[PDB]
Amino acid sequence: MHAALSTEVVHLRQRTEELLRCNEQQAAELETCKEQLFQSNMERKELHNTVMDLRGNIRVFCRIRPPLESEENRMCCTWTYHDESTVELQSIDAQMGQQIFSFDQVFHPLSSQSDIFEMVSPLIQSALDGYNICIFAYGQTGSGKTYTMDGVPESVGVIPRTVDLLFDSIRGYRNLGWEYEIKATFLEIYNEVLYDLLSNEQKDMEIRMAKNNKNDIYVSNITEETVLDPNHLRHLMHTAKMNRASSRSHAVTKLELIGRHAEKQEISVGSINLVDLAGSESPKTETKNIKRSLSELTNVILALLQKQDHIPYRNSKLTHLLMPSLGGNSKTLMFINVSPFQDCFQESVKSLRFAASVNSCK
Amino acid sequence: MHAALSTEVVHLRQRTEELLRCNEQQAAELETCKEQLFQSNMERKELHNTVMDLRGNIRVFCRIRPPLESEENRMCCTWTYHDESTVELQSIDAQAKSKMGQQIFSFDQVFHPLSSQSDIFEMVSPLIQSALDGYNICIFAYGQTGSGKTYTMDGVPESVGVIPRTVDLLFDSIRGYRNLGWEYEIKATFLEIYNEVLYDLLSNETEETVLDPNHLRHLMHTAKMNRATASTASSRSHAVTKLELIGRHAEISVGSINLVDLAGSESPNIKRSLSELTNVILALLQKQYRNSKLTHLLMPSLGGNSKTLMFINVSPFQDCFQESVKSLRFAASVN
Numbered sequence: 171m172h173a174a175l176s177t178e179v180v181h182l183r184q185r186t187e188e189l190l191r192c193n194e195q196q197a198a199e200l201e202t203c204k205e206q207l208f209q210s211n212m213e214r215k216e217l218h219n220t221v222m223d224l225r226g227n228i229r230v231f232c233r234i235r236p237p238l239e240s241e242e243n244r245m246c247c248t249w250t251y252h253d254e255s256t257v258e259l260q261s262i263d264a265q266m267g268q269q270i271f272s273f274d275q276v277f278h279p280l281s282s283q284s285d286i287f288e289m290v291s292p293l294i295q296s297a298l299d300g301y302n303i304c305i306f307a308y309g310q311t312g313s314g315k316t317y318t319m320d321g322v323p324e325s326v327g328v329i330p331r332t333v334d335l336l337f338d339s340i341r342g343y344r345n346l347g348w349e350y351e352i353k354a355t356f357l358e359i360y361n362e363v364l365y366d367l368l369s370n371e372q373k374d375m376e377i378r379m380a381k382n383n384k385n386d387i388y389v390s391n392i393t394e395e396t397v398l399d400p401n402h403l404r405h406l407m408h409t410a411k412m413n414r415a416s417s418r419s420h421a422v423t424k425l426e427l428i429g430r431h432a433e434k435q436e437i438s439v440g441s442i443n444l445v446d447l448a449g450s451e452s453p454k455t456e457t458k459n460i461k462r463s464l465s466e467l468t469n470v471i472l473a474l475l476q477k478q479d480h481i482p483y484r485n486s487k488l489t490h491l492l493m494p495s496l497g498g499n500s501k502t503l504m505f506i507n508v509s510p511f512q513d514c515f516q517e518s519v520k521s522l523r524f525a526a527s528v529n530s531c532k
Numbered sequence: 533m534h535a536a537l538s539t540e541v542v543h544l545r546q547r548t549e550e551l552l553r554c555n556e557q558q559a560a561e562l563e564t565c566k567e568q569l570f571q572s573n574m575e576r577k578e579l580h581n582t583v584m585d586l587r588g589n590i591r592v593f594c595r596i597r598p599p600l601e602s603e604e605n606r607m608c609c610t611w612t613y614h615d616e617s618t619v620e621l622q623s624i625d626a627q628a629k630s631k632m633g634q635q636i637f638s639f640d641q642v643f644h645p646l647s648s649q650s651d652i653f654e655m656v657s658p659l660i661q662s663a664l665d666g667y668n669i670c671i672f673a674y675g676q677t678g679s680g681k682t683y684t685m686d687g688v689p690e691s692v693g694v695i696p697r698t699v700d701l702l703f704d705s706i707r708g709y710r711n712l713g714w715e716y717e718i719k720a721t722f723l724e725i726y727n728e729v730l731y732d733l734l735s736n737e738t739e740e741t742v743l744d745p746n747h748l749r750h751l752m753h754t755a756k757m758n759r760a761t762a763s764t765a766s767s768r769s770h771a772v773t774k775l776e777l778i779g780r781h782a783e784i785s786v787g788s789i790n791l792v793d794l795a796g797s798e799s800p801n802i803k804r805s806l807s808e809l810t811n812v813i814l815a816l817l818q819k820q821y822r823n824s825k826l827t828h829l830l831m832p833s834l835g836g837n838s839k840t841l842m843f844i845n846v847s848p849f850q851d852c853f854q855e856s857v858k859s860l861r862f863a864a865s866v867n
């Protein structure tokens with residue numbers, strides 16, 4: 171019947187016209203809501219940045235690790251916590267002035283990995299909002315550096331926790347229209363010489379100005395993996411640590427967050443630089459450059475603090491590598507790891523001595 | 533053939549199922565968006581608290597009231613909002629931008645004339661829950677007559693304000709300390725001032741605890757009514773409202789609440805209490821009392837270790853311009 175079809179058409183055009191209409195109102199609401207969400211996050215980002223500014227763009231921490239179940243009769247020095255920020259160490263040698271230092275926070279032998287991450291988590295957000303972060307673990311060998319950054323399968327550290335935070339955040343960000351991409355890169359620094367950790371073929375790399383920014387950095391010939399998913403990253407990390415076989419080398423692991431918002435044509439890029447510094451201990455029993463680097467690094471932070479105008483980042487491979495992350499907007503976390511034992515008293519006092527020169531900068 | 537019109541019935545069935553799927557697609561994106569937008573608003577407001585708590589012990593909010601349903605003939609000046617906390621006013625006449633032509637001030641928050649009573653109280657909220665943690669909160673209303681002070685502190689039975697709204701939460705909080713055990717006693721109080729002569733909003737010529745939510749809500753409205761002031765018979769009265777609290781774990785958590793509705797800030801009597809409050813306040817901020825009955829009276833639920841809060845009410849009218857600028861100036865001065 172032609173009349174049936176004719177009637178089904180007229181109805182069809184009716185449902186189509188009603189749907190096109192109701193369909194254009196959603197498009198309209200979706201639009202404003204989109205705009206107000208972008209605008210809202212934007213302010214949220216700024217409100218977050220203010221809080222980071224108020225707690226400090228450069229904060230120093232202290233972490234005396236618990237003693238190992240295998241060597242304990244080496245009477246740990248005498249530790250006293252004058253408050254959750256100030257700590258003092260005395261030696262058990264029967265008779266300097268005193269040895270007391272202030273931090274932004276002090277973690278004792280019972281502070282869990284989870285507890286230290288809580289000092290870092292806020293920064294994973296800043297990196298996602300386009301800021302650069304640097305996280306160091308400074309101290310003598312055996313004091314706690316590696317266990318703090320990487321950790322142990324039994325109890326994980328800063329880096330593994332950051333990746334879980336990253337992917338969880340990144341995943342959520344999608345609901346805002348941001349598509350994030352992570353650039354992974356791992357490297358080492360023995361004698362002012364850079365070594366890639368995702369390859370074996372020796373190749374000479376070097377720090378050079380970046381394409382679209384003479385202020386940014388670029389390491390030529392290094393492996394820069396574009397993370398596919400957390401499996402891909404887990405593979406990369408395990409693979410990295412693999413070839414890392416030391417306490418006289420600087421291990422840097424950089425994750426660069428490239429956020430791309432398509433419909434708003436806005437781009438965001440921040441970076442996390444997790445550094446497992448080399449032993450700060452003094453030579454006893456040739457290690458020229460290792461004392462250079464560490465001092466250069468601690469001088470650049472001290473400069474950054476007193477707002478020194480022209481800073482010589484190039485005076486060292488490391489300080490040159492992290493230069494764009496030691497800049498203005500940047501935030502820097504510094505974990506001073508320490509050993510409780512007697513034999514480390516003088517060494518431990520050396521480490522801690524950075525806490526005084528940091529705030530004496532006022 | 534004409535049965536060839538089955539071509540269009542088919543072609544249409546698709547457009548139909550097309551716009552149908554596309555209908556259902558936008559409804560999902562729009563649900564996620566409102567969802568996310570709501571998460572993004574919460575975070576923003578909490579970080580905003582952390583910021584205000586991190587810097588000072590005194591918040592300043594600015595509130596611009598919309599034109600009353602009866603003032604379609606009053607001219608307004610040009611208002612400009614640059615942020616959520618930066619507002620500027622420009623006079624209507626040219627010769628006005630001839631002298632320091634830039635009136636722009638910054639506060640912890642600026643409320644548009646279309647801001648709901650709930651939007652306001654939402655900034656105050658964080659301070660009520662703070663009283664049960666031991667502090668002395670202090671809420672103020674400042675501005676000329678016809679600005680929004682009373683409407684903000686109290687409100688209208690159709691639209692409740694801060695003083696009422698607190699109450700609600702004040703309890704919903706105790707319903708939370710009464711879990712493993714803790715008991716509270718709401719010591720309410722109601723007074724006022726006229727010309728340095730304190731009266732009372734309860735009896736006629738006076739602290740009674742509260743043992744019933746609506747009970748507190750009663751002596752509250754009683755006071756509201758006992759507050760018999762039709763316009764300038766209230767242009768010089770300071771409507772204070774003490775509300776001390778105490779709690780012992782079921783070791784006596786003492787807090788407070790000091791809601792105030794100051795007198796018109798514009799030119800007139802004495803009104804020194806204000807020029808006095810200002811000094812007392814700027815001096816506290818400077819961080820280093822009986823010049824007015826007011827200051828002296830609430831000279832403890834202030835000072836150090838107490839979170840205070842001030843509202844600056846303004847009218848969007850051109851004839852108010854100097855008075856407004858006078859009010860923003862003051863606030864800014866705190867700023």
Ligand SMILES: Nc1ncnc2c1ncn2[C@@H]1O[C@H](COP(=O)(O)OP(=O)(O)O)[C@@H](O)[C@H]1O
Binds near residue numbers: 312507
């Ligand atoms: N906080 C800690 N808790 C438990 N073990 C720790 C802790 N810190 C360090 N260790 C132990 O120290 C040894 C090597 O750790 P680490 O301190 O990172 O060396 P380095 O200080 O040279 O980086 C390991 O046996 C590790 O388990």
Ligand SMILES: Nc1ncnc2c1ncn2[C@@H]1O[C@H](COP(=O)(O)OP(=O)(O)O)[C@@H](O)[C@H]1O
Binds near residue numbers: 596676678679684688
């Ligand atoms: N934010 C507002 N929204 C709607 N009306 C308001 C607002 N603020 C004040 N008003 C109106 O202004 C009039 C007087 O209010 P109010 O500001 O309390 O005066 P005063 O500042 O002298 O105490 C009332 O009619 C009130 O409804």
Ligand SMILES: [Mg+2]
Binds near residue numbers: 312315316
């Ligand atoms: Mg190590």
Ligand SMILES: [Mg+2]
Binds near residue numbers: 681682766
């Ligand atoms: Mg009034």
